[PDB]
Ligand binder design. Structure first.
Ligand SMILES: *[C@@H]1O[C@H](CO)[C@@H](O[C@@H]2O[C@H](CO)[C@@H](O[C@@H]3O[C@H](CO)[C@@H](O)[C@H](O)[C@@H]3O)[C@H](O)[C@H]2NC(C)=O)[C@H](O)[C@H]1NC(C)=O
Ligand SMILES: *[C@@H]1O[C@H](CO)[C@@H](O[C@@H]2O[C@H](CO)[C@@H](O[C@@H]3O[C@H](CO)[C@@H](O)[C@H](O)[C@@H]3O)[C@H](O)[C@H]2NC(C)=O)[C@H](O)[C@H]1NC(C)=O
Ligand SMILES: CCc1nc(N)nc(N)c1-c1ccc(Cl)cc1
Ligand SMILES: CCc1nc(N)nc(N)c1-c1ccc(Cl)cc1
Ligand SMILES: CC(=O)N[C@@H]1[C@@H](O)[C@H](O)[C@@H](CO)O[C@@H]1O
Ligand SMILES: CC(=O)N[C@@H]1[C@@H](O)[C@H](O)[C@@H](CO)O[C@@H]1O
Ligand SMILES: *[C@@H]1O[C@H](CO)[C@@H](O)[C@H](O)[C@H]1NC(C)=O
Ligand SMILES: *[C@@H]1O[C@H](CO)[C@@H](O)[C@H](O)[C@H]1NC(C)=O
Lengths: 479, 479
């Protein structure tokens, strides 16, 4: 049995137990607060049965507190569980449905076949819970359109890896595949074609599918930069340049914040998750500055020719729109770095590789929750075993007091879409993102390279077996 | 119509012609030297018909010289053809079957559908032939075992790209998947498992399949280094180390050259191609030197403690074995660089990235035919549009007289198997190898980056359409 990520506490015995496919149930212990009526658990029981294939007859699942079956996971969902692997009835015990889903994955990783076909598990006890609560994968469905199928498999692979946030970078300069109901033109004119679109029903599917796995779907609607496609269905939203044609959203018109309010109100209803990622990265001033109506606004606010001041103005106003619909904001570092005024609990995401520990220190010294992604740019491929580099990151090596560190809520592996699509996305992501997943779940001090190597190669074969085309770590084979 | 690689001469007119799927034949002109009895051409006609889907009724194919239907391509096979695209009957005219196969690919790339579905081709004339005759892809089926299927698709993708040599690096340190009939133990004990093997019938298939496409299958049986797996089924073949256990083949025993003669005689019958690649790269001396029976041989030949002298001894003896069965040798630069005596027409393959133009000059100054692969290590992946780097290579920028340059016979894109297998091989290879293919086929002076970009993105969609999962070049979509 290969475990990935490696649970917080594992105690095994040398007593072997066996399982009979046509004769082994997973079900609710009579004391569980969840029962048959509970889809999320029901579907899990069935799909894991499949994954899995001196007696163990059964795995009882006991949800201790109110199960939250019908809810969406959020930031502080309880993921803890325990596993007592014993004859004749094994037990998975969790506070909440979210714990149970994690535990089921761990249990599956413990069943295995000996040289003769026999399904075997060791007597053991497992105590487990995540080291960090925000465990993301970022996907880019604008640079390339990812079909819904491929998004779902990703969700499956994320489950197998205990990741819990799908950071959906849904739109960008190149294409606007999100179909909006109050704004039909955005996608009609900005999508790559009528069949590179996510309908409200595609969005619905992805969301449910992720929920059923304890995954949160965090939408990113990046502004004011990276918004070239928004302009095709929105008259007057983008700044016109005086010489490129268009630059960032024009932050000086009422019509602009008008639209943005309507829009984000729709978003706030479509995506159940607490947070909206607002982007705010990489905004070009060269354009705003060549433009005379902006010139004029700069004069009227006395902003000089510091265009950060204007980036601030805009972003802050959007921040307020988000606050007004009672949602949280996430924001790329640039927003913080350019000193906009942020509400308490705004999450800042540190993505710039340049001395990010000092970034982490600054953000946390300001008292904001912080998410790391900088050393985890997976689109940034290179030769050989780079998973090691990702795995060896210690997110908490920065200067900062205890309370400061408590503000670090986790991180994301990023796969940006410039060079990625259906043809290459999976082998590119996996197992490389696994290294990231284990570091974000297991202990601080889980770091033997040889052992990591060993479980990872075996985990990867498992993934392949479950139809994730994850790529090799090094020379070898499966079975 | 996107062309790749771009034929030597293309003359188009603005007259459009149309094609009717259920009504368009490719067949033999009555004067062709090939007719129905000719499988290679028959199968081509059918498979291209499929690829393809004011009138063009037909494409007549005229083979001018003896067709060579039943032969294997070799180094100097005639690949030239012409294409007269006219109503009502178009004409493909080639000296040989090999030309015809190229031409058919070009014709397919010229048919296309307008906005209304209509199959269209422009009136045009095409004159085409390759700038270099050796156009390889190297695959590694030892670091990972590639199933026969995936080898075949590669062969298909190579055809679509006019590549004509599959450099089969079949065995290496990690695994010996080649099943040998005079040596059953080699694969029984050296393969990854009984089901990671190439049977004589797998080899037969691959060979025919490539032949049917004008592809030569060049086997590499690398020695004396990279031979760790040979040892599991061959007692006494590998040097034992005195402290790793085993090092390179022990070049001092008779039993060694005994085996190697039997073996290469089997190879010489199994693989139809003229050349055998002998490897000869990266041989470690640290082992031979720790060993006392080698020590003793060194003394008896008065080789001092220059172990190149012994690498020479061995390799030369193998060279003679090859010569004795009337086959050609190919050899990695190290063999030349360590000054072994080579027969006239031994091909040296330059693979080391360190100032290879001066390597090219030295080899060609010695009068040997030379093959470049150094700037074309495709396993050496990196971020972004690296196809450009590959495409911009000018193989002939080295110092050397005309006659010297005439010795440069071509090159290979290499995909070594340390990090590669079925899960990632195709998107890794394609379209990156396309850049290599065009540079090895088209003119010296075909090099507009924008145009290359444009045809390549379109070529790549074609490949995807024909079920090659080739990866993107940059942001965008197909159709
Ligand atoms: C899960 O259960 C399996 C099966 O009990 C455990 O594997 C077994 O481990 C013992 C060591 O505790 C092996 O015994 C050994 O015998 C040889 C002499 O032949 C010697 O090298 C050692 O000193 C040792 O006594 C036993 O072979 C081994 N494997 C099997 C298949 O029975 C396994 O350790 C348990 N896993 C965990 C993580 O607890
Ligand atoms: C293959 O045949 C097609 C169809 O004839 C050729 O495309 C056509 O090219 C002409 C230019 O020769 C286009 O005419 C243009 O008209 C506009 C005014 O509306 C003006 O911008 C130009 O000065 C020019 O006169 C025509 O639209 C165009 N396309 C089609 C679909 O008919 C094509 O060039 C041929 N390809 C090659 C490589 O020869
Ligand atoms: C937040 C940065 C960012 N934002 C957007 N909208 N797109 C991107 N492609 C990136 C990016 C930055 C660095 C690398 Cl190496 C790769 C991608
Ligand atoms: C001829 C060199 C060679 N021979 C063998 N048998 N295996 C290899 N993997 C390589 C190799 C060398 C450099 C790179 Cl970058 C990648 C692979
Ligand atoms: C934004 C939102 O709906 N947050 C809820 C919160 O009330 C609850 O206590 C938490 C932990 O279970 O999960 C979620
Ligand atoms: C090694 C071998 O069989 N070479 C043959 C050669 O006789 C022939 O002339 C050449 C060109 O058509 O093709 C091949
Ligand atoms: C623009 O903004 C102000 C205050 O924010 C608003 O009330 C006003 O009517 C708007 N003006 C125009 C000209 O659209
Ligand atoms: C080894 O080599 C020689 C000559 O090449 C051969 O004739 C001889 O009999 C061999 N000796 C042994 C001891 O195997």
């Amino acid at each position: 049995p290969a475990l990935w990520p490696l649970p917080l506490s594992v105690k095994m015995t040398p007593n072997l137990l066996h399982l009979a496919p046509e004769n082994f149930y997973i079900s609710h212990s009579p004391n569980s607060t969840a029962g048959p009526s509970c889809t999320l658990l029901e579907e899990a029981f069935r799909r894991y049965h499949g994954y899995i294939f001196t007696q163990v007859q059964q795995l009882l699942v006991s949800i201790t507190l109110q199960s939250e079956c019908d809810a969406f996971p959020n930031i502080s969902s309880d993921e803890s569980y325990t596993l007592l692997v014993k004859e004749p009835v094994a037990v998975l015990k969790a506070n909440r449905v979210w714990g149970a889903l994690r535990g089921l994955e761990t249990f599956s990783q413990l069943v295995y076949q000996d040289s003769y076909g026999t399904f075997t598990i060791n007597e053991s006890t497992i105590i487990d819970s995540p080291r960090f609560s925000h465990r993301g994968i970022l996907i880019d469905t604008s640079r390339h359109y990812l079909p819904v199928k491929i998004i779902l498999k990703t969700l499956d692979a994320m489950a197998f890896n205990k990741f819990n946030v799908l950071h959906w970078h849904i739109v960008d300069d190149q294409s606007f595949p999100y179909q909006s109901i109050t704004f039909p033109e955005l996608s009609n004119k900005g999508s790559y074609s009528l069949s590179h679109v996510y309908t409200p029903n595609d969005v619905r599917m992805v969301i449910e599918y992720a929920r059923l796995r304890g995954i949160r779907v965090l939408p990113e609607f990046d502004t004011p930069g990276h918004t070239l496609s928004w302009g095709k269905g929105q008259k007057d939203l983008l700044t016109p340049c005086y010489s490129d044609s268009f630059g960032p959203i024009n932050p000086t018109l009422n019509t602009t914040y008008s639209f943005l309010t309507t829009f984000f109100k729709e978003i706030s209803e479509v995506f159940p998750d607490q947070f909206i990622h607002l982007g705010g990265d990489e905004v070009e001033f060269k354009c705003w500055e060549s433009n005379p109506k902006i010139q004029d606004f700069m004069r009227q606010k006395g902003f000089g020719t510091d265009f950060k001041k204007l980036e601030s103005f805009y972003i802050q106003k959007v921040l307020d729109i988000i606050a007004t619909i009672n949602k949280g904001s996430i924001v790329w570092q640039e927003v913080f770095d350019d000193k906009a005024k942020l509400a308490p609990g705004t999450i800042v995401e540190v993505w710039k590789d340049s001395a990010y520990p000092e970034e982490l220190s600054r953000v946390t010294a300001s008292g904001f929750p912080v998410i790391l992604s900088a050393p985890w740019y997976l689109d940034l491929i290179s030769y050989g075993q780079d998973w090691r580099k990702y795995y060896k990151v210690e997110p908490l090596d920065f200067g900062g007091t205890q309370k400061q560190k408590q503000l670090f809520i986790g991180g994301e592996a990023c796969l940006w879409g410039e060079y990625v699509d259906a043809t290459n996305l999976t082998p590119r992501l996996w197992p490389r993102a696994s290294a990231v997943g284990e570091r974000l779940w297991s202990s601080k001090d889980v770091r033997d390279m040889d052992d990591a190597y060993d479980r990872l190669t075996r985990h990867r074969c498992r993934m392949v077996e479950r139809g994730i085309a994850a790529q090799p770590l090094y020379a070898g084979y499966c079975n």
